[PDB]
Amino acid sequence: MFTGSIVAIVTPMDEKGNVCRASLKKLIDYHVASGTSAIVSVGTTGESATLNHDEHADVVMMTLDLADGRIPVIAGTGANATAEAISLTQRFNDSGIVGCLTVTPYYNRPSQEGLYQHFKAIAEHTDLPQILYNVPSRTGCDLLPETVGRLAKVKNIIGIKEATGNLTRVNQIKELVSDDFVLLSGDDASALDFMQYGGHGVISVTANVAARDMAQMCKLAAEGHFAEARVINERLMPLHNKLFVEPNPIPVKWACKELGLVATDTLRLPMTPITDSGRETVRAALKHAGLL
Amino acid sequence: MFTGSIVAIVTPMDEKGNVCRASLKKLIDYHVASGTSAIVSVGTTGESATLNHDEHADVVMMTLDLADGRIPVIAGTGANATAEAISLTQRFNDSGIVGCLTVTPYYNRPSQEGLYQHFKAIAEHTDLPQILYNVPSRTGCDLLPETVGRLAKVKNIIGIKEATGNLTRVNQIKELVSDDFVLLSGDDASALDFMQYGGHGVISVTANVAARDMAQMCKLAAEGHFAEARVINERLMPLHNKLFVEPNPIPVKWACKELGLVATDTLRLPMTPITDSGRETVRAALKHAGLL
């Protein structure tokens, strides 16, 4: 069962914007050493939007190769066209990934029935576990609990990354699905609360640069030690907030570079370099976490 | 300049979801007869999301062919990766299109500076007029007037499809740009108001099925005869609303079929068929307009 601190890992790039293998290796080694539960490869934080489908496949396969069985890998496989979602998913069949993270279609704003048919078709063209992903602030679409309940009855649909920050969704979903269906936070700032309300873990931006503390916090939460978890969360709260001072993953890539975890903080357009003001904001947050 | 009633044309499909040339021809003939000012090919209403790159290029080239110089064509060229947007734009250089409609990157939520660099790079890889397209409800991104001002100094960047329905944007933009820069409504329900506030036209879904009326309304608006323009808008007001209760272009494709303009109302997933309530309200709206 997917649980704990799952990193939405950045896709580290060289100065030309190509995937930087040495830096990816360093990040993967860091998450193994830190006790990160799993890696989400080419999620939103991994710049899924600006990698073409073959580059996307390359990054996931590279992540599996470097992981070398030490840490589970979940592939980002979301698309706003159902045919493309199916194709991406089929690409990773028998790759070694343990699951797929698949976002509600963005931009075209399908209905709840559209969302149902989309994810059902995807699930029917795979043997891999499927984690649904709702983030209306990015997509223009809000996958409601009722529809999640319908999808949870479909073979292979086994969880959700709920990124609304709306804590009422936890029990609204939980009462419509079986006890084995996983609820994962997609909002670092509210993730500990999300777990205390019944969530099983978090797919996290913060875990990129505070992997040890995130893993400890999620462990404590799982054990019901929320007082202790809250101390860590408060330590990390400036990071939870300031990693979004400029658009994700601009701040977190800078932070990775600053901590020596990656060679460069290069992104692909329309993502642009962190401003000087952003640098200092993020630096302060890293200092608050005892990381700088 | 680009003015008047510009149709965001549906991409008619057969039962298998493949582009239907016979129906596309009928629509184009209809727009020539109806006095539509131009056609936007493979915009949001044209299911840009679910056509692959080659299909997208094919629809644009077929539309140009069938237009046969009788009506200007504008290609949808938007993408959430700057490299992809540049490639799409380059595909249509020397195609015969008169301009491009290019939406703010969706899903990845760039900064205003990201938007500036995105659209600047696109503009620098073409000689074609660029119409920026802002629709935050679909993209998670809002291109602000200040940024539009900066972009309007870039060569080739000559207008905006403003789809917020926020009438305050009209003059917040106009005051920062040249007299030749065009403001076009991307929101049918507020399009006459938008023109009354200083806008130059509309990129319309309603024009798909009420082309003559939309053309007349925009003409009366441009002439300053808003009382008379209102009579037409009141006639179309139910269509302006009911073409969007279920996700666009599901309603408008059904309406096209009901009027005999296309052979089938088929869409591609994650779009799904119109519901019973949809059929009834859209049918009523068509009757209200005197079209059925």
Side-chain angles (χ1 to χ4, degrees), chain A residues 1-14 16-154 156-211 213-292, chain B residues 1-15 17-145 147-292:
Chain A
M1 193 187 188
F2 290 110
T3 69
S5 179
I6 303 175
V7 65
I9 202 171
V10 295
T11 298
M13 293 160 181
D14 61 27
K16 302 320 189 187
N18 295 312
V19 66
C20 192
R21 187 185 177 94
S23 298
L24 182 58
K25 182 187 180 291
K26 192 164 183 178
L27 289 179
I28 293 165
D29 290 343
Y30 162 78
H31 289 297
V32 174
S34 303
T36 299
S37 294
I39 294 167
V40 170
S41 180
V42 193
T44 310
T45 307
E47 291 168 82
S48 62
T50 57
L51 294 175
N52 71 40
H53 286 128
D54 298 330
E55 287 175 323
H56 186 149
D58 174 46
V59 171
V60 174
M61 292 168 184
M62 181 174 298
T63 299
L64 280 160
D65 185 20
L66 296 167
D68 198 30
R70 296 175 298 158
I71 183 168
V73 178
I74 293 150
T77 56
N80 67 351
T82 308
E84 186 48 50
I86 291 173
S87 177
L88 267 172
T89 303
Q90 287 172 154
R91 187 78 172 269
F92 300 120
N93 285 357
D94 283 28
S95 66
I97 67 173
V98 295
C100 303
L101 179 66
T102 180
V103 71
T104 55
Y106 38 85
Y107 185 60
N108 54 0
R109 305 192 77 194
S111 63
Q112 296 303 301
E113 179 66 17
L115 290 176
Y116 178 78
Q117 291 194 25
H118 178 78
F119 289 122
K120 184 159 177 293
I122 291 159
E124 287 169 346
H125 288 80
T126 189
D127 295 311
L128 290 168
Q130 302 295 302
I131 303 163
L132 303 174
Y133 171 27
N134 190 46
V135 56
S137 67
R138 292 179 178 280
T139 62
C141 188
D142 186 12
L143 176 66
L144 302 181
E146 187 254 359
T147 312
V148 178
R150 295 176 69 198
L151 284 167
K153 297 188 200 306
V154 181
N156 298 318
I157 302 184
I158 55 70
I160 188 166
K161 178 179 171 186
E162 229 300 328
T164 60
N166 181 163
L167 300 174
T168 72
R169 294 293 170 94
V170 178
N171 197 248
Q172 286 172 180
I173 294 169
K174 211 136 171 188
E175 72 184 5
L176 298 180
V177 300
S178 77
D179 292 325
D180 48 30
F181 188 86
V182 301
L183 277 291
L184 300 166
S185 175
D187 179 56
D188 279 292
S190 66
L192 182 52
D193 290 341
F194 186 98
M195 289 182 283
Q196 194 165 20
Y197 276 87
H200 305 274
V202 59
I203 297 175
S204 167
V205 179
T206 304
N208 276 279
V209 294
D213 280 1
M214 282 300 298
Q216 186 61 206
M217 185 180 82
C218 291
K219 181 176 171 285
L220 290 165
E223 295 168 351
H225 296 133
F226 286 102
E228 289 82 352
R230 281 195 289 278
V231 172
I232 299 174
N233 192 236
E234 288 168 330
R235 193 192 299 140
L236 296 175
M237 194 51 76
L239 273 178
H240 296 332
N241 296 327
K242 301 314 190 193
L243 289 178
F244 300 89
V245 69
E246 292 169 34
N248 179 231
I250 296 163
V252 74
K253 272 188 150 183
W254 180 81
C256 286
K257 185 189 169 185
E258 196 67 11
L259 295 176
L261 290 168
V262 297
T264 103
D265 66 344
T266 302
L267 313 108
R268 298 180 176 195
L269 287 170
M271 293 305 102
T272 60
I274 192 166
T275 68
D276 287 335
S277 183
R279 247 182 280 269
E280 295 315 307
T281 298
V282 178
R283 191 180 271 95
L286 288 161
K287 284 190 162 72
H288 192 280
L291 293 169
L292 281 179
Chain B
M1 32 181 274
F2 294 112
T3 62
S5 180
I6 296 161
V7 62
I9 202 165
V10 296
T11 301
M13 287 159 188
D14 64 21
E15 56 172 11
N18 291 311
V19 181
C20 196
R21 183 191 179 86
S23 293
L24 180 57
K25 169 171 162 54
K26 191 166 189 184
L27 291 182
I28 290 165
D29 283 341
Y30 163 78
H31 285 294
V32 175
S34 298
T36 303
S37 289
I39 295 168
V40 164
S41 180
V42 190
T44 308
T45 305
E47 284 167 274
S48 61
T50 56
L51 295 177
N52 74 40
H53 287 114
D54 296 337
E55 293 173 320
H56 187 149
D58 188 37
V59 174
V60 171
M61 303 304 173
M62 281 189 34
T63 300
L64 284 167
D65 187 2
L66 294 166
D68 197 31
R70 300 174 295 153
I71 184 165
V73 178
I74 297 156
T77 53
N80 66 353
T82 310
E84 191 177 305
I86 291 166
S87 292
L88 206 46
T89 304
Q90 288 169 149
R91 269 185 187 265
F92 301 122
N93 289 354
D94 300 347
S95 62
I97 61 175
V98 294
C100 300
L101 179 70
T102 180
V103 71
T104 61
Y106 38 86
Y107 185 57
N108 56 358
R109 303 192 66 204
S111 62
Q112 297 302 294
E113 180 61 15
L115 294 180
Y116 179 77
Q117 293 296 332
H118 178 75
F119 287 122
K120 184 168 184 285
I122 294 157
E124 286 168 347
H125 288 78
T126 183
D127 287 323
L128 290 169
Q130 304 296 299
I131 304 167
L132 308 171
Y133 171 25
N134 189 49
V135 58
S137 63
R138 290 182 178 277
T139 63
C141 181
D142 192 0
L143 171 65
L144 302 179
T147 309
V148 181
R150 293 173 68 199
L151 283 166
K153 303 196 79 55
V154 177
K155 209 180 322 299
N156 302 334
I157 298 184
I158 51 67
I160 185 168
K161 179 177 172 184
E162 229 301 326
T164 55
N166 183 344
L167 299 165
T168 299
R169 293 290 172 94
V170 174
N171 289 288
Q172 290 181 156
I173 291 163
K174 281 180 81 176
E175 75 182 9
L176 301 176
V177 305
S178 90
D179 294 347
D180 295 319
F181 187 93
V182 297
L183 278 278
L184 300 168
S185 178
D187 184 60
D188 274 299
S190 63
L192 183 54
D193 282 344
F194 184 98
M195 289 184 288
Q196 201 165 28
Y197 273 69
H200 299 103
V202 60
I203 297 175
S204 169
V205 178
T206 301
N208 275 285
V209 298
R212 192 161 214 98
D213 292 302
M214 283 299 294
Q216 234 311 74
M217 187 183 70
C218 290
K219 185 201 185 169
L220 291 165
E223 289 171 354
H225 300 133
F226 283 95
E228 288 79 5
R230 282 285 155 204
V231 172
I232 300 182
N233 195 248
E234 282 284 330
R235 201 149 72 232
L236 300 176
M237 194 174 290
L239 271 175
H240 295 333
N241 289 320
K242 298 305 176 181
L243 289 178
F244 302 89
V245 174
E246 296 183 38
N248 177 230
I250 296 162
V252 72
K253 273 191 154 183
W254 184 82
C256 282
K257 190 199 190 313
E258 189 78 349
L259 296 180
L261 289 165
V262 303
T264 102
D265 65 356
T266 306
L267 308 108
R268 298 180 176 193
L269 287 167
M271 297 301 104
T272 67
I274 197 167
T275 71
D276 292 329
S277 62
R279 282 190 287 132
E280 294 311 303
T281 61
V282 175
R283 186 186 282 102
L286 290 169
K287 194 167 176 69
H288 190 282
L291 303 167
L292 270 187

